[PDB]
Amino acid sequence: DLRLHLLLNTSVTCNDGSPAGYYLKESRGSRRWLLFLEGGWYCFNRENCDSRYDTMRRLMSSRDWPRTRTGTGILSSQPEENPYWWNANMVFIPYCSSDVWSGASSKSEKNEYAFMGALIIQEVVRELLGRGLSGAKVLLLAGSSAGGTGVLLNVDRVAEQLEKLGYPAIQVRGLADSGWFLDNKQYRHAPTEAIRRGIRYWNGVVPERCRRQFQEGEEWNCFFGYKVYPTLRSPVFVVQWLFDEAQLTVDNVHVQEGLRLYIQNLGRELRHTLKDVPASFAPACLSHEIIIRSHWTDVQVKGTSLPRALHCWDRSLHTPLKGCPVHLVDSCPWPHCNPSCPT
Numbered sequence: 001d002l003r004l005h006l007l008l009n010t011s012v013t014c015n016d017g018s019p020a021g022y023y024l025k026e027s028r029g030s031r032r033w034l035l036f037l038e039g040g041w042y043c044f045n046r047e048n049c050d051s052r053y054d055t056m057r058r059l060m061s062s063r064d065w066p067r068t069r070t071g072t073g074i075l076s077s078q079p080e081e082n083p084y085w086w087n088a089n090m091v092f093i094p095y096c097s098s099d100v101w102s103g104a105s106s107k108s109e110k111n112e113y114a115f116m117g118a119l120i121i122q123e124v125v126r127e128l129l130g131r132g133l134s135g136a137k138v139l140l141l142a143g144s145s146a147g148g149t150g151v152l153l154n155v156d157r158v159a160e161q162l163e164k165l166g167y168p169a170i171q172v173r174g175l176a177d178s179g180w181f182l183d184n185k186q187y188r189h190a191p192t193e194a195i196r197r198g199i200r201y202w203n204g205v206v207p208e209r210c211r212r213q214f215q216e217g218e219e220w221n222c223f224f225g226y227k228v229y230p231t232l233r234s235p236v237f238v239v240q241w242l243f244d245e246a247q248l249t250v251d252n253v254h255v256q257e258g259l260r261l262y263i264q265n266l267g268r269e270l271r272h273t274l275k276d277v278p279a280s281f282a283p284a285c286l287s288h289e290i291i292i293r294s295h296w297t298d299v300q301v302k303g304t305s306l307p308r309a310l311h312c313w314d315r316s317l318h319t320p321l322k323g324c325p326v327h328l329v330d331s332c333p334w335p336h337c338n339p340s341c342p343t
């Protein structure tokens with residue numbers, strides 16, 4: 001079990017002004033720290049956020065959070081479930097800001113909701129430095145779905161924060177799961193518009209180099225992995241199903257020739273965007289997240305599981321390693337052409 005800590009700085013809040021927080025399980029024998037960002041879509045105006053508050057309130061408030069959570073998948077402390085980092089210090093950061101982890105805006109007399117995702121990550125890191133993180137050798141910022149996009153938006157800011165606080169020895173790395181989306185044309189006629197509205201509603205922030213490329217009004221581009229990734233300095237391992245269900249949902253895909261060609265082209269486009277991503281794991285499966293599922297060990301690309309690829313990535317961050325690959329992208333063109341895809 002990971003134990004809840006609400007932030008001591010209670011001005012860093014969930015959407016409704018309740019304190020944000022994190023769940024922690026320490027491993028005093030370990031200098032590895034895994035901080036995982038939960039996902040769960042986002043909301044982008046008063047009306048859609050009010051709807052989310054009625055029926056997805058745990059994603060907007062800490063008032064009903066449980067005192068503990070069980071770590072699963074990459075957050076598991078059992079080596080059988082987590083061959084990769086079972087002995088690490090484990091941190092689960094609940095997603096309660098509805099802003100893809102990008103916001104820096106308080107609730108106020110002008111704002112019904114607070115969107116503080118980027119500040120929640122910063123404050124979690126700051127408070128963890130007093131609970132052991134100051135001794136870390138590696139901080140892996142991981143996340144799934146909106147949390148995976150959150151890794152992309154925030155990993156270099158975590159690295160800068162630790163440098164400025166006087167901890168240049170902590171190596172900050174990112175693991176972005178299911179957060180690598182394409183701003184493609186829908187199958188029937190969108191992503192970009194809702195992100196553009198969201199960033200304005202949230203006061204959303206993006207990494208500085210990407211901001212400087214795209215400039216004002218165009219920062220929505222930095223929410224798309226293939227555009228933001230090249231601007232990042234921290235090592236980032238990208239996990240993405242080639243036929244991700246959330247990508248298909250935004251594309252209005254729910255099989256005749258036009259749809260067959262659409263799906264094949266989507267997989268080819270995704271594979272193309274990962275060609276120059278050296279640490280990546282991209283199986284040809286129709287599915288959603290990977291990394292906190294208890295059976296995350298089961299899928300393989302070219303005979304290599306994700307926990308193995310991640311271990312190979314760790315070794316590479318000590319020339320390619322014999323039998324220990326880190327770039328694992330399926331080339332077969334249709335969902336479940338890889339026999340290890342989830343059931």
Ligand SMILES: O=C(O)CSc1ncnc2c(C3CC3)c(Cl)sc12
Nearest residue numbers: 039040041145146149181191223246
């Ligand atoms: O959290 C979850 O379960 C899914 S989050 C999600 N789903 C679909 N598209 C996106 C985007 C881009 C607009 C394309 C983000 Cl940027 S985040 C996200």
Ligand SMILES: *[C@@H]1O[C@H](CO)[C@@H](O)[C@H](O)[C@H]1NC(C)=O
Nearest residue numbers: 009010011012119120122123
């Ligand atoms: C609490 O967090 C806010 C937002 O980051 C910050 O402005 C303020 O300095 C913090 N308070 C303390 C006491 O550090």
